[PDB]
Amino acid sequence: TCPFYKKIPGTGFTVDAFQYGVVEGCTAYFLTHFHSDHYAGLSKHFTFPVYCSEITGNLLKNKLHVQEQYIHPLPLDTECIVNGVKVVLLDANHCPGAVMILFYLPNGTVILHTGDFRADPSMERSLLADQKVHMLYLDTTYCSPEYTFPSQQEVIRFAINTAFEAVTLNPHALVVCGTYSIGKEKVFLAIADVLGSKVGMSQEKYKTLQCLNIPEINSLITTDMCSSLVHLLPMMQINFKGLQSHLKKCGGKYNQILAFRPTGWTHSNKFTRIADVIPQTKGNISIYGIPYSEHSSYLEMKRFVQWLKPQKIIPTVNVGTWKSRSTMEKYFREWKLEAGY
């Protein structure tokens, strides 16, 4: 059974609700982004209207085989009428094709559903500037002040400089980057660009990347691993065993691996500055965990909500424990008393 925080009152709509069978009264299912916790349940047999971005629709058709007749892609930043209700899709600053959804209810209520997002001051000049929001359905993934991490631009600066130094010292070093979903593509694209290389990967991963509308993609990626000195592998293989195994397959071309594991937040963020980060090393293999987040930090979240001044907040993450729910409600009341709304 579909939980309440995935239903949109006064409409036939649900958000990210595909794992519950047929939802009673649902005339249109919205999908905010192509991540498995959110699409859980969709397949080629799905027969109801799905509303999403163009990029998410490309992935539904090619990776999950959903039939074309049930995919309804909408442009961003554009007022659209769906089943007699005005909606707008906005860029969520999460993974490629991820959106927030503005719903203008027939009774005059305005609701914002963030999906998953990384809040940014640029959002304060989207179509959100214009008007009041009565209800915010909020991505609360890192809603506590201990969750700190650097900007994505600082993290990429660190990765490019680390890779370029290593390979200039040793031209026979291979660079490997881990992946398990869409998102974080800048990590491996920025490294391959500084090294003058295409990125090499499996046929399955190449197919996924070909759905993303990235400009000049055919100039940046390949399935010919022998032509590339930046390889992608599943995240599960980014360990000394899996990396040793990979290096054997490379035909004596390389004598060293430098690997990157993009993570979200980890507890070493509570102590160690990005500049000071060091790898784990075994012999000729080194592995860097880098904190490249596609979710809001606590401070980014707080800024966005204090700017928006919503009348009511419904969290969509960390909702399963009483202790989590109580902590989140305390910070929402602080924010409101501090800013005066």
Where on the chain is the footprint of Ni ion (CB under 5 A)? 35, 116
Sign of CA dihedral 139, 143, 149, 154: positive
Question: What's the closest the beta carbon of residue 36 comes to Ni ion, in angstroms?
Answer: 9
Question: What's the closest the beta carbon of residue 335 comes to Ni ion, in angstroms?
Answer: 24
Question: What's the closest the beta carbon of residue 16 comes to Ni ion, in angstroms?
Answer: 9
Question: What's the closest the beta carbon of residue 66 comes to Ni ion, in angstroms?
Answer: 19
Identify the CA nearest to 15 among candidates 116, 155, 97: 116
**Residue with smaller CB distance to Ni ion, 7 or 35:** 35
**Residue with smaller CB distance to Ni ion, 35 or 246:** 35
Question: What's the closest the beta carbon of residue 74 comes to Ni ion, in angstroms?
Answer: 19
**Residue with smaller CB distance to Ni ion, 40 or 339:** 40
**Residue with smaller CB distance to Ni ion, 116 or 300:** 116
- Helix axis angle for 322-339 and 298-308, nearest 10°, is 50
Joined tokens for residue 21: 């069978």
Residue 280 vs residues 164, 179, 321: alpha-carbon distances, Å: 19, 19, 35
Beta strands across the sheet bearing 13-15: 7-8, 13-15, 28-30, 50-52, 71-73
Identify the CA nearest to 159 among candidates 196, 193, 127: 193
Question: What's the closest the beta carbon of residue 295 comes to Ni ion, in angstroms?
Answer: 8
Residue 147 vs residues 76, 191, 256, 293: alpha-carbon distances, Å: 30, 26, 34, 11
Categorise residue 30: left if φ over 0, alpha if ψ from -120 to 50, beta otherwise.
beta
Q: Per-residue DSSP letters for 58-106? A: HHHHHTS---GGGEEE--SS--EEETTEEEEEEE-SSSTT-EEEEEE-T
- 10, 109 contact by CB (below 8 A): yes
- 118, 300 contact by CB (below 8 A): yes
**Residue with smaller CB distance to Ni ion, 88 or 92:** 92
**Residue with smaller CB distance to Ni ion, 211 or 257:** 211
**Residue with smaller CB distance to Ni ion, 231 or 295:** 295
Identify the CA nearest to 47 among candidates 24, 21, 73: 21
**Residue with smaller CB distance to Ni ion, 7 or 295:** 295
Question: What's the closest the beta carbon of residue 17 comes to Ni ion, in angstroms?
Answer: 15
**Residue with smaller CB distance to Ni ion, 98 or 159:** 98
Q: How many CB atoms lie within 10 A of CB 284?
A: 15
Question: What's the closest the beta carbon of residue 56 comes to Ni ion, in angstroms?
Answer: 12
Q: How far is CA 225 from the centre of its chain?
A: 26
List Cβ neighbours of 63 (8 Å cut-off, separation of 6 or more): 34, 207, 208, 211
